[PDB]
Amino acid sequence: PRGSHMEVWFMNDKEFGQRVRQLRESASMTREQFCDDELELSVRQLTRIEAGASKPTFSKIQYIATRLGMGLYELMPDYVSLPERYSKLKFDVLRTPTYGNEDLAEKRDAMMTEIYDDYYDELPEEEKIAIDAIQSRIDTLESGTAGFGKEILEDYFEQIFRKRKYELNDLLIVRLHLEYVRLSSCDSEIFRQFLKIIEHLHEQINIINSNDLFVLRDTLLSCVNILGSKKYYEPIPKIFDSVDKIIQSTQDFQKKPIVSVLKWKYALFVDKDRDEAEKHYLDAVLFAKLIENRELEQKIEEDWRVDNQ
């Protein structure tokens, strides 16, 4: 029962929003009643969907349908899942180890451009924000990212803090909240919140899908830099514990050198104990020798030299 088979007009963002409103209204529900606890779908998120300014993710359409008693395809007959080429590019981008490889970091940004050229403009909203979360930087505390103003992102952030189980896009979108922490004082609300996020991310390890663990790992590593920018070194060791325990379950091992460097830097610059630091330096070298990556080995050798001036 597709739109092409009934010969009807295709529902783009506006005219779909129009339908979602109709069905909600005629079922005597208001936005506040409809969204309920706002975990899956928020009131602000719904308003923009009805307005035609935001395209819903699969999980959101699913919820909108179930909440109206309808099937997914009864609501959106012409629904299609995310392009296979897009989902591949996203996956490759997120799984690229950058440190030590100049060549792979070049393929990474190449993929990102292909995403922006071909698929980004037609993704659902949550998916756009998650792609931006990969490498967008916020210059100003008042402003948002490109395309999206703060009030949107806040709504997504608040949604995630309440969630019991983070999806892959939640683990990405959180990374934008970190860019706001960078601009705020150590005394701020935003910072004390950011510490609660770290607490959440730890508990998420034994809750999220096994397959998503690699994104969580890298999100926890993003916190180390941020904690460093505020000289709040206390929770860094526990991050390392968790990152190592994730590396064990996943059997991924690509971040072993990155972690060992970060471990030496803590020992060297925070603890000022370069007997303990040199140990991790040697692990990273041994690793780079075993996988036979000269570039990585030379990078590790160089950084160690730089850090003893």
Residue numbers in the entry: -4 to 304
What text appears in the publication on this structure?
The ComR-ComS receptor-signal pair is a regulator of competence for genetic transformation that is broadly conserved in a majority of Streptococcus species, including those pathogenic in humans and animals. ComR proteins are members of the RNPP (Rap/NprR/PrgX/PlcR) family of QS regulators, including Rgg, which are prevalent throughout the Lactobacillales order.
However, the construct used in this study behaves mostly as a monomer in solution when assayed by size-exclusion chromatography. The observed dimer interface between the TPR domains appears to help promote crystal-packing in this structure and the two monomers exhibit an identical conformation (RMSD = 0.192 Å2). The monomer is shown in Fig 4B, revealing that ComR S. suis is comprised of 16 α-helices divided into two domains. Helices 1–5 (residues 7–72) constitute the highly conserved DNA-binding-domain (DBD) and helices 6–16 (residues 79–304) comprise the tetratricopeptide repeat (TPR) domain that is the predicted site of interaction with XIP. As the active form of Rgg2 shows a domain swap of the DBD domains, the observed conformation of the ComR apo structure appears incompatible with DNA binding and would require reorientation of the DBD domains. This is reinforced by the observation that the DBD of ComR packs tightly against the TPR using α-helices 3 and 4 (DBD) and α-helices 8 and 9 (TPR) to form a significant interface region. Indeed, relative to Rgg2 the DBD of S. suis appears to be held in an inactive conformation to occlude helices α3 and α4 from interacting with DNA and possibly inhibiting dimerization. Although the DBD is highly conserved, the TPRs diverge significantly so that only one side of the putative XIP binding-site pocket exhibits sequence conservation among the ComR species in this study. The homologous residues of the inner pocket are electropositive (R103, R170, and K250) which is likely required for optimal interaction with the C-terminal glutamic acid moiety of the ComR S. suis XIP.
